[PDB]
Design a protein around this nucleic acid. Sequence first.
RNA 1: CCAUAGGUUAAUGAGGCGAACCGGGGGAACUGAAACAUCUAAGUACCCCGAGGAAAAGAAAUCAACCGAGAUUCCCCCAG
RNA 2: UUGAGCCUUGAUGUGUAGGAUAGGUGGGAGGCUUUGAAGUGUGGACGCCAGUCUGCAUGGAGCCGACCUUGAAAUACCACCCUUUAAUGUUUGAUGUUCUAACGUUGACCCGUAAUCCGGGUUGCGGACAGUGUCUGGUGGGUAGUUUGACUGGGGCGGUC
RNA 3: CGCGGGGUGGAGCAGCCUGGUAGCUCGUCGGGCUCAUAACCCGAAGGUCGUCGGUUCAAAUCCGGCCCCCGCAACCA
Lengths: 149, 77, 134, 116
Amino acid sequence: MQVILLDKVANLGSLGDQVNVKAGYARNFLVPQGKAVPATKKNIEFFEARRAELEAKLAEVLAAANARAEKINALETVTIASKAGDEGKLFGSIGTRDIADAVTAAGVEVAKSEVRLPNGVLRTTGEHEVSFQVHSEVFAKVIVNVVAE
Amino acid sequence: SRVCQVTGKRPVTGNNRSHALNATKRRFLPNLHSHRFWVESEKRFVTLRVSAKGMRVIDKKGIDTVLAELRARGEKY
Amino acid sequence: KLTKRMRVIREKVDATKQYDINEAIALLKELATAKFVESVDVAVNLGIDARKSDQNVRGATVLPHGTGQVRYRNDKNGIIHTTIGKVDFDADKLKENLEALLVALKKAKPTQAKGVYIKKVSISTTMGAGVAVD
Amino acid sequence: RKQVSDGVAHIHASFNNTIVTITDRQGNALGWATAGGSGFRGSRKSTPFAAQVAAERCADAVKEYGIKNLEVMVKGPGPGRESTIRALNAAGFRITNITDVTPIPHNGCRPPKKRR
RNA sequence: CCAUAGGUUAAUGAGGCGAACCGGGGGAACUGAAACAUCUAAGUACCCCGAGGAAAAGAAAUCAACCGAGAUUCCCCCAG
RNA sequence: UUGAGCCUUGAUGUGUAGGAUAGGUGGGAGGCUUUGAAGUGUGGACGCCAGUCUGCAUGGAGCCGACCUUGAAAUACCACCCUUUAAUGUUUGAUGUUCUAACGUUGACCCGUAAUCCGGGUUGCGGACAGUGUCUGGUGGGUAGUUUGACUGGGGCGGUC
RNA sequence: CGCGGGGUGGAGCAGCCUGGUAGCUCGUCGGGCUCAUAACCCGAAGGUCGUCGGUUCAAAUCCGGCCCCCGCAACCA
């Protein structure tokens, strides 16, 4: 299925070629995520005149406007108090909106769609570093402790 | 009922012709599936009970152009 | 495995570029740059084989040019190999000379051929690589 | 081939038969030879000589690995033991260390009643 | 958040009955074959939906035989 | 991960006679080299371990044609490709692992709402499986339609046609 | 109506693929053994491979036919 692109992609396409993907890849993922638009002829001529440089490069500059809000977390080191047992043994480990809204009051306006955890749901006690892909290109890196309440 | 909301396929009938040509009645059911479709204009998901051929029509015509004529036939997606 | 003679030859003859009618006749002259005059090596890739000997073709070339009326032999895996003259003969001389074998092979038809006789020819200047004329 | 240098020779010297398995250090087997495979079906495999030819027939089954250092692990009651090690020493292997790994229980499983 | 879903009110229309005919969706079996299964009975009986005074079809991507004919419907022949 | 096809540098198969890890015939009987040789050292690879090969490079401008005995001609140049290898690209396939965005949810929560249905929304877990459609093999007295001969000293059994 | 497979001393099994260099298990005989039988070790006698054609420097194996036994799936005078 021939389709033209709107963001770059995590793969083969680079904003302006019309790659031929399988029909499930376009219909279920690319078009509702706004990373593509189907390549009928009325959209191909919509691409070269309207799309190709006007606000297609609104996206990359707004990515670069987020590539410093990438590092508007100048502290990257937030501890969260939740009651535990003696010697570790947490009652309930913090999740990912439990860490997104933790950094909301202490830095960046981030929801849990943008938080990526390497190892589970951070069950234990100690300074562990949770990754942050608010951005599509490069992650951000935030150290987090959890102590007993 | 088992009708595609786009094309309007219906469960037609036929025969089960055996090897010795014994005709027994049967039914052909039209491959229906419920599928959420992302309409870009309305900025939402519309769930339609379509056949598999109906998805190709929505992948050939516009979704909203297809959904324009479901409005014209008095369908209520 | 390959040295400075066919180093110049094998990228000047393109064996995987299967040439057309009036293409391959002159582009193989640069592959005979030795102290001695080199001749032709013709390999009409046929539809014959020695499954049994009813698919055998012998014969001759009734050729006024020659090396000469040249005869030929059969192979078992189904390759012909002839020699019809020299390559220091002029350029378009090879065009009528290659297809004079095929008018000699069209009348040389094998009787147990369940298929077309030839598919496509490749020739060589006896020391280089294959030149795929039609 | 992998061509490993140091290896382990296991010897299963049971009462009826002896099995000589040459492995690497980790335990992965490389080749083996028993007394029954060398002929000697019956009473002849229960002798020390059939153990000797079983070790020799196992030495040239690992010629493609070029083992030079062998540590021997003998296990069992059989007459194989003190003759199948000498066959490895004559075979051109350097005996790094010998140990017996004979499994002796710390008293529990009922053994059979057998043989009146 | 917007917006939709929903709610309320008003306007307009439908609903139900009826004999046959008509279009469509489903659709038998006894019977005939001197048994019977393919096949017949028959797309009949029946069920269901829909409409009109008629309904259906209907202006050739039709036929014809190189000569031509010119939408559909119905009757008589072709022809058992 | 990985076959299987495919592009191509590159690669393969000594019975014996008797120098000859050479597939069949030859074309043609010389390629070759100082845009720096025969003989060698070895990392290996291969192996009926018989024997050939190549790379940092030593050596470093000469090696060598049918001659030798051969049933045969010498990757000294050779064509097309045979058994098997080669790496580069392609083609899908095969599994395997992971993902989530289809799809599932007879998990939790919110709203429609005074509602154990339903729908929508968050969220969790599954996840391209499951499931359904078409096609297809197997199974299928669960069900259905039917068949199951005639003569015959009554019919059956026996025999016969 | 078609896919491949098995047929090897009296009796049963390998080596088929990668061609030459027909081996075993028992039963028969001959030795050794034992107080005797059994067992056991050595050696031997019995088939040129169901049959018919091919090629090569050499085939019992490979190439097709032809026969019997299959194991199946197929099969509407």
